[model samples]
Target: GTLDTTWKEATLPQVKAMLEKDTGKVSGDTVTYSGKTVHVVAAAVLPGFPFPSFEVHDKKNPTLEIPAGATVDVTFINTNKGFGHSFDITKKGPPYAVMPVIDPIVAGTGFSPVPKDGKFGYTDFTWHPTAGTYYYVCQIPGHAATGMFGKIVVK
Candidate 1:
């Protein structure tokens, strides 16, 4: 019992989260960077972003309980001193894959690589889903294999 969509549209429902402090836990609405956390508002947008504010959350996020229907824009923020993290959604593959409904993101692809601090880079992607459950992971080669992944419901 889940919801996932397929590139139905790419400009309606967007999301943003943070991989801060090297701890573990995908941010839902507010993201931390440069030693501070920022909230992901409806259209407040990020510092260098043009548009597409997000609806983000981890397992604790209420939005996760009721996903969007047509689209979801996901953004990630990574900085040095903190763990190099990224989000990868896919269909199904190796290692302890974490799934909200226990599954993966189809036609798998990862977010823009955030290797470490100081380099300065973040990942921003637009997900086009089609009613199904999807899985996410750090696409930093073998990261997910170490059990660095999570689950999210889509619609």
Candidate 2:
């Protein structure tokens, strides 16, 4: 037997509902899985300035699994509520290394892409090695710790 499903372009309202419905499940952003791949998007509402807290829809499954040597692409759509924001990916450790992909500053709405097998850290595009946990947070000061952080696990 086969299951049939319909998908429509998610409206802003629908997305908002999803965010509000499962706020705690995620760490600092919302995660939506589509088939074997998962899509992690910026949450609609943040805590304070420079963007809201990194409230995710799926924190339990932050780490994403991909075929070894596969060229995977991670996209970050900046929907920061307030000040401009940036995104980065880095290896987990002291003297963290910055991943090549540096998302452009997104003041309101924008998108950035991260290539596969690449690791670095991201913030508001100003600071370096903001904190820990392969963090993805706002660089606009006091944002990373204020729940404006998330991670991407690639295995």
Candidate 3:
């Protein structure tokens, strides 16, 4: 079986289908699912963004609230025009440098940005979250500092 901490690439159709399946439950720029495991499908630098940003469930850099102790499955898609992007949940807030040193709280998975090819490269990582406040950022150079980040609250 694949370990929850391993990052795996996904196709565009898979990402699109994931978002569409949850469309009815999307509210206030946020999406919530009921169950022990929660699924989040986020796209990085989707078309129409002048600045680097994450579009989660079709909303730009929205806050994600999860129930405490649930296993979080985050699927990060890279839709940037000419750059790669990586998704990470960390205790550190941005103002990130070209090679930012992040204090990661998610599986110590480290940073690995996806390429910007027509293949629509994407990756997935799972985190067993505890009650706390955290931030999800794009670990690509100064992307997060430029606003490719958002809030994550576990309650």
Candidate 4:
């Protein structure tokens, strides 16, 4: 859930309403759960502005649990911001793969259905392999250290 200042100024209310619905599937800045779409907005962490921050609902972590052999579609939306953000998945080891999202290049937009069973990495919308306790983080310079990271538990 990557968002920028423009999105926050324009659709923050709608996004907040969506989050209150408690949806499960995150679509764009929104989450679709229980047949509902909750728009979650994130702050921008560009060069000049303050480091963007993300807040996970229900006190739950950012990681999403997926059953083994299951196909999961992850949609990453870039809220209105100057710089871009990347969504990467990788195992807890070396030889990491990078997948980036390049299409529909604009904020307040996104992509979905990341190719299953493949390694990913990107400076903007990349994919990576997922297997047992993988880490997901934004590779935007100091983002990873600024707490823009989470863990994915497969199986």
Task: Encode model 1's per-residue lDDT on 53-112: one tens digit a residue.
Answer: 222333211223213354444444432233334455664544543332334445333333
In the range 1-155, model 3's lDDT, one tens digit per residue, is 22233445555677677777442245567654446667777777655666776777767776677777677777766656666666767767545555656654464334444544445566667778778777877666778787778777777
Q: How close is candidate 2 to the true structure, as a TM-score?
A: 0.39
How many clashes does the backbone of model 2 have? 22
Give Cα-based local distance difference scores for all models: 0.37, 0.33, 0.65, 0.37
Cα error, residue 85 of model 1, in Å, equals 3.6
Model 3, residue 127: what's the lDDT? 76
lDDT of 1 at 39: 23
Q: What is the lDDT of residue 2 in candidate 3?
A: 20
List RMSD in Å for every model shown.
12.3, 13.2, 3.8, 11.5
Quick one: best TM-score, which candidate? 3
Sorted on lDDT, best first, the list reads: 3, 4, 1, 2
- lDDT by residue (8-108, candidate 4, tens digit) is 12243533553453335553443222321222222233223354443334322355444445444333333424445544444332222233322232232
Per-candidate clashes come to 21, 22, 0, 24
| Model 1 spans with C-alpha error above 4 angstroms | 1-68, 80-84, 93-120
Ranking by TM-score: 3, 4, 1, 2
- Tell me the deviation in Å of residue 91 in model 4: 3.0
